[PDB]
Structure 1
Amino acid sequence: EAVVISGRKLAQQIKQEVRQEVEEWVASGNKRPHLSVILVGENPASHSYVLNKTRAAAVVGINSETIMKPASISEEELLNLINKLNNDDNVDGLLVQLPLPEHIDERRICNAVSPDKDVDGFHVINVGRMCLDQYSMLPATPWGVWEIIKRTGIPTLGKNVVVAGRSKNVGMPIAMLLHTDGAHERPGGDATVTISHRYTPKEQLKKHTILADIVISAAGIPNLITADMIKEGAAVIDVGINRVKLVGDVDFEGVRQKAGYITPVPGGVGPMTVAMLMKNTIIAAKKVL
């Protein structure tokens, strides 16, 4: 039977590490870190996720605020608020929760966040630097996926990995992190990585997953990964959060009988996203990059 990896337990540990780092930072005479989150509209999942982020901020001793705005806000109004926060020296980290309304360009918004406060790692320079394996602010969900694998001791060098999903904020960075050189400035996982997406035929997906030592599903499709697609002992990491009750992309009970490792939904990658954001916020407050 498969080890269920508790993302909540891993994330709680990581937050204790950040809390100690923040306390030593403040005891050293530096200002306490402050995270600003901009929430637009009333997407219920977004409100939940931001509450988890502000909760975690309090846990690790980082000050925070959520600024909520109606979905009817204009792009220029969002850009003025972002510029205000860019110029407020008390704000160390700034993020705009996604998705945004159709009349607001996410890329222009993400690029307006000052790169030193870009705790999401969504600024184009951070994206470019990450794709060149340079030191960068790593996006929270891909980094939490990598940390799950690393802290569980699951090997990646020379191994076969399939990522289902190519979204720019989740699936593409996960594939970048896992396939790149371990020796570069920002090390990668040195895996052989297959990127699948909405136009991969289900039979070809299975033909690649059955070879995989790690399967990482970030598609948002319930029961996309089933026990027959997984080789025995493989690690399966479920990034999907599908409202159907919340399920992942993985047939949890089915794959649990064949995988070596498996993360649950909820309580797997989600809390890890929040913990890695805390790590990015103390990194931003320290002006390391």
Structure 2
Amino acid sequence: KILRGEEIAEKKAENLHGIIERSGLEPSLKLIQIGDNEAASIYARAKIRRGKKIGIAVDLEKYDDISMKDLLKRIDDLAKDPQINGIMIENPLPKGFDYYEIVRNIPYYKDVDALSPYNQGLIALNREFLVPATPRAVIDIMDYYGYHENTVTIVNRSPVVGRPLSMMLLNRNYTVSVCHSKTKDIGSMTRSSKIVVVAVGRPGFLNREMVTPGSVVIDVGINYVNDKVVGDANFEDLSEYVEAITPVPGGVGPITATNILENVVKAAEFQKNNL
């Protein structure tokens, strides 16, 4: 009933270690950060920290200011270095820089954030290669707690969560509904699904009206309100009422960094097998 993530991250990180030591890989991950955004920084350092434990060399390159032309050149150079298995740009970026523009210059087999068109399309086609970390984290919760072949309603249609997630849930036989700010009756869809995945960035959005007693809630929202991080679900309204709910922090959060590192291992292992 409390869907925690850290124990799932620990298991994933153990077998990643195992997979590295086993097949001799020495995966390398480059992280590019522009600006000094504080969420990005914690996320970067978490990937360095778990990387150092798993056996993954993770390096951050911070730039106070960098031009498009320079940044594209840097990425192109990392792209060509066979010593670099994964490349990732941290978010958010400053205005004028389109993430999706930059990211398609990273070979799909190095694209560990897995948001480029090629990885997204491989998911659509049901031939997952690299898959993005939050959607992955959603399914990890479901795999590890025992939810299969259910109706799922996703509240979110962005390319980072909602869309790749619906394609990953279809690959695994779930029945899927996506709704969003243009759905006129969200409550109706969320109450009729076994699972609700919520990501609207809106504290208290998912309350008792939006779910039934059978429901399982996976809260992918991250809101910073009066000095604390909080999800999109009303945890205290819901915990006495739903079947299961991921807390925030402590739900899908702890898994994300490890899922990026999981893509780095897959990237490095495809490069070894295929060049």
After superposition, give the CA deviation of every residue in 1:157-203 in whole Å (9 maximum; x if it has no partner): 2x32111111101111112211x2xxxxxxx23222221112223xx
1:183 aligns to what? none
Partner Cα separation in structure 2 for residue 115 and residue 190 of structure 1: 26
Partner of 1:138 in structure 2? 131
Asked if 1:274 is matched to 2:274, the reply is no
Q: Unpaired segments of 5 or more residues in structure 1?
A: 181-187
1:43 to 37, 43, 57: 37
2:111 to 110, 114, 118: 118
Distance 1:45 1:131 in 2: 29
Do residues 211 (structure 1) and 192 (structure 2) align?
A: yes
Correspondence for 1:251: 234
Deviation by residue 1:3-47 (Cα, 9 ceiling, x = unmatched) = 111111111111111111111122xxx4x1111111111111111
Q: Does 1:85 align with 2:66?
A: no
Which residue number in structure 1 is paired with residue 18 of structure 2?
20
Cα deviations by residue, 1:62-82 (Å, 9 ceiling, x for unpaired)? 011100012x32211111111
Q: Deviations over 1:126-179 (max 9, x none)?
A: 111111112321111111111111111112x2x32111111101111112211x
User: Conserved in 2, the CA contact under 8 Å of 1:214 and 1:237?
Assistant: yes
After TM superposition, the score normalised by the length of structure 1 is: 0.90
Amino acid at match of 2:174: A
Is 1:230–1:258's contact at 8 Å kept on the other side of the alignment? no
Work out whether residues 115 and 159 of structure 2, in 8 Å CA contact, stay in contact via their aligned partners in 1: no
The separation in 1 between residues aligned to 2:4 and 2:56, in whole angstroms, is 24
Kindly indicate whether residue 47 of structure 2 is the aligned counterpart of residue 53 of structure 1. Answer: yes
Q: Stretches of 4+ moved more than 6 A in 1?
A: none
AA in 2 matched with 1:236: V
Q: Is 118-127 or 189-198 further displaced after alignment? A: 189-198
Amino acid at match of 1:169: V
Offset at 1:226? 0.5
For residue 167 of structure 1, what is the aligned residue in structure 2? 158
Secondary structure at 1:220 match in 2: coil
1:228: Cα distance to partner?
Answer: 2.5
CA contact (8 A) 1:145 1:272 kept: no
CA contact (8 A) 1:166 1:197 kept: yes
Deviations 1:257-280 (A, max 9, x none): 111111111111111111211211
| CA distance 1:176–1:135, change in 2 (3 Å) | closer
Any conservation in 2 of the 1:82–1:113 contact (CA below 8 Å)?
yes
**Match of 1:260?**
243
Counterpart amino acid of 1:234?
A: S
Q: 1:33 aligns with which of 23, 27, 31?
A: 27
1:232-283 CA distances to partner (integer Å, 9 max, x unpaired)?
1311001011001110000011111111111111111111111211211111
Q: How many residue pairs were aligned?
A: 270
Is 1:197 paired with 2:191?
no
Provide the C-alpha distance between the structure 1 equivalents of 2:142 and 2:43, rounded to a whole number of angstroms.
Answer: 23
Query: Which among 211, 225, 228 is matched to residue 230 of structure 1?
Result: 211
Q: Percent identity?
A: 33
Deviation at 1:230, TM superposition (A): 1.1
Q: Secondary structure at the match of 2:29?
A: strand
Q: Do the aligned partners of 1:75 and 1:105 also contact (CA within 8 Å) in 2? A: no
Specify the code of the residue in structure 1 equivalent to 2:103. Answer: C
Query: C-alpha separation between the residues in 1 aligned to 2:129 and 2:30?
Result: 20
CA RMSD of aligned residues (A): 1.4
- In 1, the alpha carbon distance for the partners of 2:249 and 2:209 equals 23
